[model samples]
Target chain A: ALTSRTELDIDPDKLRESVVELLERHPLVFEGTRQLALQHRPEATDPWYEGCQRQSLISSDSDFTEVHGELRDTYLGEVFDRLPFKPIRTRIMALDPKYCYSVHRDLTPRYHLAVTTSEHARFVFIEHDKVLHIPADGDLYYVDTRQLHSAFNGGDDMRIHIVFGTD
Target chain B: ALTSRTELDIDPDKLRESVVELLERHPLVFEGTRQLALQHRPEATDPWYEGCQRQSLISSDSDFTEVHGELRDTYLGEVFDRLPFKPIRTRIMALDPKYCYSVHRDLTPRYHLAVTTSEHARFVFIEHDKVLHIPADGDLYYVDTRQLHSAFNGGDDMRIHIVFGTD
Candidate 1:
């Protein structure tokens, strides 16, 4: 499917500030285990899979973290005001440096707001032979996760993005 | 700007046949002078501008030749049935072989339906430093012509497309 919009009307500097503050207060927010079913585990000797960490900011029940609750409310509240949609799951996702994700498909569509990334961080979707790049430029993007896709972080710095799903 | 849809649902073979029939019956249809304000003139001895040629099929006045009239009615009728829009001008545009257009901008947005093309035929729009290609497959496309753009046909065959404007 096509993207809902290329760029969202949001202040990138404000978003970056909130993300920085949240990370400072909740340093261990990205230490959780992988939720998606994968063949390989991060605890494996070689650790074939070692990327993609998430810090949930909103759930179906409107629950969020205490330290980052105000930050989440401010950012997500503004997003809802513009988009006017009920989001099911909202989180800040990170892809660590020198890590690659295995090809997989998701049942539902995923929307993203890229926060910080470099040219070496690649977000790609594969349809048959064609590989489409999902640009990480602090813009809103709707990726049809039903198709085979993967992400890789080749840069030294970690890539962070805000992800959400609509009801 | 992003396209609304990358490709349109239309029979390429049927469109090609219609183009051939219209060209055969109205050989002098493309003889009409261009209506756009071009920087170069085709009649100049140097002939700095010798790129595009067009055959009008439909206009605001509803005046068209016999061969092109029926073809326009049938094609535009089917398009209106699917898209359902009020069109202002409709025509078959051709870019001559080994010719390129100078960079320019159009006042209004233009929709295109490619009839015939070759790999050497290039349609592009420039945004700052980025040059985006408009694929020449037999599909409907909404091009943001307000941006600086140019087209070229480096192949032996003349590139043809059905161009239209909406109210």
Candidate 2:
């Protein structure tokens, strides 16, 4: 039995900086999009056009050690080790304007923790007959990733966010 | 030795929900604002606002257990206790847009871990004689808050953030 909690009004400045740096340093936008799509079942027909202006996977084995070495050495390495959950892997995702993700759920029993930021965006959570709406900037949500959910960016500008998972 | 890392992009749906919930549950907006302003200034001219936020020892002691009872009973409580840093204090901070906090570091010897979500704001840090900007919807900054830093939210909207400090 797993539960979820949401923490609001977090540090936005930190969110912007980390995301920009990660994206700039490692342009995994193309790689992540293609990979996640391929990994998704029903075999994505249009892999290249999977998501518009979206970047993916900032903290993979190849990416984490290469770009965010200092972060890994300091906080994530020691601190995550001390926590109760074990991190299976991490991904950084950015969604642009008009980009909408299909409703889906993670396959594993992992705990999901994410720090999200956007110029303007919206998230709709449909779990257990509940519709939770989350808006842009300084939002942190710990959710049961296994639950059915979907996200959309209806705004004109690009909506960027990161999804990091822990188990 | 101090280094300011980059910001992170957070999920908007989660961000909006958390902040809204925190604000609804806690009705001390006027009082918390007064406390943060006074705490920002060790010695200011306003004698009326010259005290720190009521400490746990002095006030009615709104325990975390009472604030997020179910969440604590599920996961966060266990994760927090097992953290490497002891004496971890989890609290919600509400900051108005007009306030500008002075640069002061957190002196706790244990590694500092923080998860902050701000309504709309900017945080400035000096690293290598350069000014780093951490914007709203920022990611968690693991820092020695004991370093020189400052924040300003010059906007019409309110700026609120939750901070977890551990030593």
Candidate 3:
């Protein structure tokens, strides 16, 4: 929820490769995020409105050191080394095209290393009057999702990013 | 930027009268705010895009005690008594229909008590993904415009707000 962005010193060539490799394995349903969306709007008659999905790189189990299945030695594993914190809840996440999540707040701020995104895909915080665009320029961005915000894609292309918890 | 909307204890009948009264007089060039828009986009190809206009009710100079011109004793003057802060550099401001300003920052946050606004008009901040909608619900909103943001009106009706500088 603050100003400015910091581009990681990682090679851009590797960044693109990591994104391509990570997408090779289809992501899971990301039920955790789905539930949060539903929690905000309990009477939502639209089930397909859940446009978000993710593939966990690190399990929620005790073994934080080991990367998850099919992610080892891949681009995700390589990028995982650059993480400052224990990649406990980090994952490769995607948002469908022309999809928008309801305005909601989170328990913690969010950090993301955008991989594949268009200019039209953005994060909107109506409460604070902010519209953040995390470019796919290998830049790292942290958002104050503790406040009300929405993840929306107003483009024809799908949006993907390496999203992690700030806590 | 922060959340929490405290709609002032305002008379809706007075609120409706203020908007129509303010527009009766021709608007001032509002050169102060007009330049801020251009500063955000130097050499803007479309100069016709200046969607903002204003008319100062309280002069920028001294004698800020009395309401200027024809605003005397109307809803505009009454709200000045109801609103917080001294009515210095106060003005009636409007954003044209279906217009958007460039992303920009300001030195100080402005106080606004929207008189007439549609849901389509919004304030956007890139800092934390904020997209604020200041409705005409007699709500008193002070935006932290010191951060980067933009004002846009995506509807047909003109968006009007009683804009005033705190200092």
Candidate 4:
């Protein structure tokens, strides 16, 4: 069974300030095509395209002990120190309103810190069927991404999470 | 922790004949909307509406049931005999292509048999998150519906299931 849980609490809204600043400079567009590299691959080409303008906050292969990202200098940086895993690729993940992902498994597990969300926003994990909200309580969560799961934001506003992954 | 399991097995397609006939006589429209009463309260009114057209096959309160539904005479009748629960209300449930239901809890659980489904169709149960596809193997399964759940059909075809409930 896929299990995800919370750890290290903070006022999620406090970290949300980072999004407020980023969005003003880089707003999201339609579909799933957006990847803002907070931490670059030292010139690595993105493999996926379109929808949810993504913003990378950490390099995909950066040394966890030696983290990177401009946002890293912000409040999210403190969160970096407290994370349970060394994020291989940490970025701002967003799901469009009423948008949903296919229930599928990922090659690696991921981590999350919900910044912007609505009551209808949810992180659905499938082991038999587990659905949950990474309530923007400022608490960080570990996701068993290798298991089947989907992100569905049934709300009006876009659902945003600081989603990180490890290879 | 919302645990449900499979019970009897059958050729769910065999029972699908009931839907084929029922739809020809009573088509579904703009559902979350229709409810076909297989067994009635002798006098009662529906409480919810507007999306998937719901067609009742057995009374919501009739004992284990003296099953109803004109289409019941079809192959669905035979499957009913093999069900694990004494269905209180049994009927053909539908979800339009690309449509998704909100994640929420119900007062009671349900029984299911997938009759018509898409590769993108799935039943999601939330208890840390369980995602599953109830293949139309003609097998019956119990669902802890009282827990949080959502039905999302991302395929081009409508998703159908024999969803039963007991009060």
lDDT: which candidate is best? 4
Against the hidden reference, what TM-scores do the models get? 0.38, 0.33, 0.44, 0.62
Question: Cα deviation in Å at residue A148, candidate 4?
Answer: 4.1
Error of 4 at A96 (Å): 4.2
Q: How many clashes in candidate 4?
A: 36
User: Which of candidates 3 and 4 reaches a greater TM-score?
Assistant: 4
- The share of true interface contacts that also appear in candidate 3 amounts to 0.24
Cα lDDT of model 2 by residue, A81-138, tens digit: 4434434334455554434444467554333334343323333334443333344345
Q: List the residue pairs that clash in candidate 1.
A: none
lDDT of 3 by residue, B1-167 (tens): 45346567886657867566544454434421221111112233422223232224312322223445345556655676776566544556666654454466765577777777766667766665657788777778888887766666555566677666656
Encode model 1's per-residue lDDT on B1-167: one tens digit a residue: 53445455667777677667756654423321222111123233322122233333322312221122244465533543454454434556676544444445666677777678765554434343232334555567886777765555545566677666665
**B4 Cα displacement, candidate 3 (Å):** 5.6
What would the per-residue lDDT of candidate 1 be over residues A102-142, giving only the tens digit for each residue? Answer: 45676567777777776555444434323233454556878
| Model 4 whole-model lDDT (C-alpha atoms) | 0.61
Residue A37 lDDT, candidate 4, scale 0-100: 34
Single-chain TM-score of chain A, each candidate: 0.68, 0.55, 0.70, 0.74
Alpha carbon deviation, residue A97, candidate 3 (Å): 24
Question: What is the CA-based DockQ of model 4?
Answer: 0.26
